[PDB]
Point group: C3
Chain length 82, copies 3
């Protein structure tokens, strides 16, 4: 019941593209919340729970490779108990 | 100092008052709600409830899941954090 | 391939947005995220999330906000750890 929580915080423009990467990669779902900040609720925070670290890592590695340079994004991973 | 538990519940908006009732009636210090959307559209809510005792978190959790999980789209998980 | 970073959360009334933001930046944080929130102790609270690679940085921010506002406003704070890619700077 120990799963991994992937977080992606990125510009709101990427809502469909990032949720595509999540859905296709095989995640059972995702959560998304409106967010603001610096680095106006112009961003979104993705939360993807996955049964395996490797899946979380694969989603993050694709999102980062495709979008980290041309859009402002951060991402991190933690573990939770389900 | 002091390790507390973070119970997260994600359910749809209409359970807001019934779930908050369960949290308060279980004797939690309080709770935090954020608006959220997702797939498993922004008419779901995310509860976060922090508790000194994993006991308290687990009861609140089972009582919510018993009453509503089968009939409503709903997820939950627990982690630990460091409070003051 | 991963590095430990600390995540500081502060939940306060929305009116404290400008003051708390300024305390985060003045301590040298690379950034912060804010979400709108409601709760009990409609979305008239705010949740800050501040990631940093030094627990000392997180401790300074937390100590200053607690000292300044936790008497006069209803707030909570906590800290946990997360993992980030080494390639990223926090
Ligand atoms: N794997 C997952 N990761 C993160 N959030 C999820 C996951 N599965 C379900 N959820 C959340 O739980 C909610 C249940 O109802 P919804 O499908 O409307 O929206 C869902 C998401 O917000
Ligand atoms: N035990 C708890 N778990 C989660 N959040 C809390 C808890 N106690 C207080 N809070 C949050 O702290 C906030 C302080 O102001 P409010 O009472 O408006 O709303 C409160 C909640 O958002
Ligand atoms: N150190 C940090 N802690 C928390 N959030 C951050 C940090 N750095 C950047 N962010 C978030 O990542 C977002 C990236 O785009 P923005 O610059 O619009 O706003 C940023 C913040 O919301």
């Amino acid at each position: 019941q120990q799963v991994w929580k992937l977080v992606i915080i990125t510009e709101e423009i990427l809502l469909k593209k990032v949720s595509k990467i999540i859905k296709e990669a095989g995640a059972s779902g995702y959560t998304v919340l409106a967010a603001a900040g610096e680095g106006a609720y112009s961003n979104i925070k993705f939360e993807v729970l996955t049964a395996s670290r490797e899946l979380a890592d694969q989603i993050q590695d694709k999102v980062v490779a495709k979008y980290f340079d041309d859009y402002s994004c951060i991402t991190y991973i933690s573990t939770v108990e389900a």
